Structure 1
Amino acid sequence: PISPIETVPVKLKPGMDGPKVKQWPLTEEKIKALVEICTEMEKEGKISKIGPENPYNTPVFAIKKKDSTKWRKLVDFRELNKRTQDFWEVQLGIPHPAGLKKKKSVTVLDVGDAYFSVPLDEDFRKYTAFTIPSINNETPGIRYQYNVLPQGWKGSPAIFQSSMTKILEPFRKQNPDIVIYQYMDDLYVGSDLEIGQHRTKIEELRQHLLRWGLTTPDKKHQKEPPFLWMGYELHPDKWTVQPIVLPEKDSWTVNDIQKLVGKLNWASQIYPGIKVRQLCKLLRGTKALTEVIPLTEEAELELAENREILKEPVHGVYYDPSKDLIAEIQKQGQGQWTYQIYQEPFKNLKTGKYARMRGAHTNDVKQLTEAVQKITTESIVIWGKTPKFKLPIQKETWETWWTEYWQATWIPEWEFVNTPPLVKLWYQLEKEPIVGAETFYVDGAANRETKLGKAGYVTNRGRQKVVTLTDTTNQKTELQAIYLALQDSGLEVNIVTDSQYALGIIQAQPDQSESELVNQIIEQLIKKEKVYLAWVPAHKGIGGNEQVDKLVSA
């Protein structure tokens, strides 16, 4: 059937006209298969023969998908697609199982020949004209145009979905308690009705759909639980990801590792503690997809931790709007974080993980905040509300950090939960210069041409050293100069620099970094008892800064 629903007016992009691609001569058998297929479609109203006045055309092709016996018509809409207007996106996002409300019953109904059951805007049909060439293209071909949404055309997914929405509207208003999810040509229907009135309401839905041109399977061919969808396995009281099998291999190739990481990332949605950092490291660099990558000991350890997590099957539960949402986060180690979301203590709706930004100076408090933010965004998408957090950081630690930091940071309602390792700041800088401590005036210059550089200092106690660096940058030399001051100073020290860049990194109390230099400086800062860092204007001949800028420039 062809639904009676009003058509969606369609147009080509402005300034463009319909496609006019020449039809390539086809073999006799393909021509025969096409004529047979088109005659069947013509009798059902899908296509109509057109006269020679229609100047448009799109290539047609016939394919026997396999060493099978069925021929399939394949229309090449690439040209028409480039000329067709843009459409609004079908879906803004995909539903997550953790956000689905519990139902007593859920049923799946698939629409048969979905696209062919929807009408195409009359004013646009002419542009879909195609031609079945005669043998050896000696005589005029047989011309046709579509009356329904063509397979492969750019507007079909969108027009079909909006058609399905308008068709369901009436039934929704009359049954505000029934839940209907549209997924391509599938319909998932759930309700809180008893198995008896449910099967009844369903039949009523099918009846309503049929009145609009959409056929569906009867209670005999309706699939049974669990439902496989978007890679999930959905059961009546719980959900999980489809069976995940970890490859058992002797030699791992780039291709095998990418597939492994992909499966682990997908599993991490409900299996707590999945790690991929060490596995992703192996994929760093450029390497042939068929190249064998030997596993480092860290990757071996991480792969074994994962196999262990994936040995005993775990599941997630559905959402209950009357209960609250709780999210817990745990530091797992080197920039890795893991979280679980639940309503009833330990019955996870879903889990997840968060990895620290690469190539950036940071500390545990910043990473936690980032993780909280990531979870907050996801919660709003999934449940439309922010959860209450349970974090591994003391209220005082957090308060000390946010009141001092120059950036605005805010965390929704949370409680401290003692689950080591705890988040803490490993050192803090003084707010005032220290008395009885040596003041180091540091500086670093680097000839941009030779790449040569020097880093040194001068103190109020007469000390002064100057080292030489090779293939360094002005930025790196300012950093080295600070590192030399820390290495040669006592437990307490005042450091004056003219490098705003260095001040910036250090004031943020970084605890982690990929830059060996910054990491060395951090190691020293933790050992100190008191460190006060000040900034002075570059070349203003300021006492101290000037007396050291000499020994460094020359």
Structure 2
Amino acid sequence: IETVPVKLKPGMDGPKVKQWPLTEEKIKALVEICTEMEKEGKISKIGPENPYNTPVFAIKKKDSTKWRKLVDFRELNKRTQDFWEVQLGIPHPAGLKKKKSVTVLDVGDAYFSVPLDEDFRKYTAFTIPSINNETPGIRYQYNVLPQGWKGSPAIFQSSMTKILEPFKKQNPDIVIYQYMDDLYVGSDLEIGQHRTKIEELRQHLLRWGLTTPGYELHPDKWTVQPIVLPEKDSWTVNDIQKLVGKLNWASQIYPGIKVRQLCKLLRGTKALTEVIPLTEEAELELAENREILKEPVHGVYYDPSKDLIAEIQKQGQGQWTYQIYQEPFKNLKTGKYARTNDVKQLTEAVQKITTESIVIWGKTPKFKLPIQKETWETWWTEYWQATWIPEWEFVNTPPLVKLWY
């Protein structure tokens, strides 16, 4: 078939990112995958005349011992945003998040069927390092649409439609959304019928040379993570002082949180241990304040133009709380994540959050991760299972974990 012409955002030049050092086992994993990808002509070796580079890693399938290749095209996606967002963007259905069930299907192998503009290929150059640098280090570039690239879905968008067409006409109440390598399929059917309609879909896919996984989400049951206020039988100065600290916070967010009554309550210079009475305005203010804290902030709306930000706090005991927002302290959504290694968990939380994020807004958030850069980089690709990679900056969590948001 003919190749779609692609171009970079003028002024910007191809990726020149370093290849993070890998462990022996993933290097072996990769030379096998790349050795085979070459026979099939999906990638060709390149020469030093190519100054470009995009990093690559090896992760695991849906827990099957088979290694998958993961190219970190985070950079090149930024250098191409114009192409895949405005020029050939893919619309996001507001109905998806409402569906009783959503299945995620990895339609990535579908891209290796299409060729890549002979002129763009150089930009997809990657390198398979070698241990202790005892060897130059294998270089390659893609000939077909690569998987981590947000350009792939956009181009293939035309074919995906022909494929899905029949299935869609025969199933008007089923939403299908494509997002970089995956298809999201949601319906309000009963688990049985849904799971059934999925198999049906795989059969259609199957006819265009494309197998499938599984993995079900239930968006209609995604609820807010309120900011809770203690409710103890007793009450100490300390307990009430804190109750005022957190409440105070709930002021620069959730307009209307009255704390003028609870405050000034039992004041002066008393010990912290000293137990205290109660107030009628108290029970009322508490109730009212928490009542307000249960439901979403007023005046906060999603703004398609601005970035999304996900902040995560390590609560302790395998507990993790996070907030997604665009304007600091103006939360679009908050949540929790629970249930061995802190890094292993955190990576899981990020993937969960990114998924929820993609279902609700169609874009991934940028993460403010509560960890040490080096530690994260050394281990994330050890528990990671997604096909995409979100944006991330390493932050330093304040004594804010006190309040849940």
TM-score (norm 1): 0.34
After TM superposition, give the deviation of residue 143 of structure 1 in Å: 1.9
Hey, what does 2:223 align to over in structure 1? Answer: 240
Q: Distance in 1 between matches of 2:28 and 2:342?
A: 69
Per-residue CA deviations over 1:484-541 (Å, capped at 9, x if unaligned) read: xxxxxxxxxxxxxxxxxxxxxxxxxxxxxxxxxxxxxxxxxxxxxxxxxxxxxxxxxx
User: CA, structure 1 residues 177+55, in 2 after alignment: closer, same or farther (shift >3 Å)?
Assistant: same
Aligned-partner SS, 1:281: coil
Matched position secondary structure for 1:123: coil
Deviates more, 1:167-176 or 1:417-426: 417-426
**Which moved further from structure 2: 23-32 or 198-207?**
23-32
Q: Distance between the aligned counterparts of 1:237 and 1:112, measured in 2?
A: 27
In structure 2, relative to structure 1, the CA distance for the partners of 1:296 and 1:120 (3 Å cut) is farther
Post-superposition CA distance 1:436-489 (Å, at most 9, x none): xxxxxxxxxxxxxxxxxxxxxxxxxxxxxxxxxxxxxxxxxxxxxxxxxxxxxx
Residue 25 of structure 2, aligned match among 26, 29, 50: 29
CA distance in 2, matches of 1:83, 1:319: 25
The structural deviation recorded for 1:396 is 66
How far off is 1:35 after superposition?
2.8
Aligned-pair CA distance for 1:210: 2.2
Assess if the C-alpha contact under 8 Å between 2:179 and 2:362 holds in 1: no
| Worse-superposed segment, 151-160 or 192-201 | 192-201
Deviates more, 1:320-329 or 1:186-195: 320-329
The 1:235–1:410 alpha-carbon spacing in structure 2 relative to 1, beyond 3 Å, is closer
8 Å CA contact 1:19, 1:57 repeated in 2: yes
Contact 2:224 2:334 in 1 (8 A): no
Contact 2:47 2:139 in 1 (8 A): yes
C-alpha distance in structure 1 between counterparts of 2:378 and 2:138, whole Å: 80
Query: Shift of the alpha carbon at 1:168?
Result: 2.2
Cα shift at 1:128: 1.0
User: 2: CA distance between counterparts of 1:416 and 1:54?
Assistant: 32
Distance 1:162 1:348, change over 3 A: same
SS of the aligned residue for 1:419 comes to: coil
Instruction: Give the number of aligned pairs.
Output: 403
Higher RCO, Cα 8 Å, sep 6+: 2
Deviation at 1:149, TM superposition (A): 4.8
Q: Distance in 2 between matches of 1:146 and 1:133?
A: 17
Listed one character per residue, the Cα deviations across residues 299-341 of structure 1 (whole Å, up to 9, x for unaligned) are 9965544656899999999999999999999999999999999
How far, CA to CA, are the matches of 2:127 and 2:401 in structure 1?
A: 69
Deviation at 1:49, TM superposition (A): 3.0
Report Cα offsets for 1:362-420 as digits up to 9, x if no partner.
99999999999999999999999999999999999999999999999999999999999
Name whichever of 31-40 and 266-275 sits farther off.
266-275
Q: CA 1:299/1:136 → structure 2, altered by over 3 Å: closer, same or farther? A: farther
d(CA) in 1 for partners of 2:354 and 2:116? 43
Query: What is the CA–CA distance in structure 1 between the aligned matches of 2:37 and 2:305, rounded to whole Å?
Result: 52
Q: Is the 8 A contact 1:240 1:315 kept in 2?
A: no
Cα distance change, pair 419–246 in 1 and its aligned pair in 2 (3 A)? closer
- Of stretches 336-345 and 37-46 in structure 1, the one that deviates more from structure 2 is 336-345
List per-residue Cα deviations over 1:193-228 (Å, max 9, x = no partner): 8999876654332111222344334xxxxxxxxxxx
Report SS of the residue matched to 2:140. Answer: strand
Mapped to 1, the partners of 2:77 and 2:313 lie a distance apart of: 49
Deviates more, 1:63-72 or 1:361-370: 361-370
Larger-Rg structure: 1
- Over 3 Å counting, the alpha-carbon distance change for 1:146 and 1:370 in structure 2 is closer
Q: 1:127 Cα deviation (Å)?
A: 1.7
1:53 aligned residue (45, 49, 55): 49
Structure 1 residue 145: Cα displacement: 1.2
Moved more, 22-31 or 243-252: 243-252
Contact 1:100 1:318 survives alignment (8 Å) = no
Conserved? CA contact 2:108–2:182, under 8 Å: no
Q: Which moved more, 1:343-352 or 1:62-71?
A: 343-352
| CA distance, structure 2, for counterparts of residue 258 and residue 415 of structure 1 | 34
The offset of 1:86, in angstroms, is 1.6
Q: Compared with structure 1, are the counterparts of its residues 313 and 333 closer, same or farther at alpha carbon in structure 2 (3 Å cutoff)?
A: same
Note if contact 2:347-2:380 (Cα within 8 Å) is conserved in structure 1.
no
Unpaired segments ≥5 residues, structure 1: 218-231, 355-359, 427-554
Cα distance, 1:165 vs structure 2? 4.5
Closer, same or farther: CA 278–195 of 1 in aligned 2, 3 Å: same
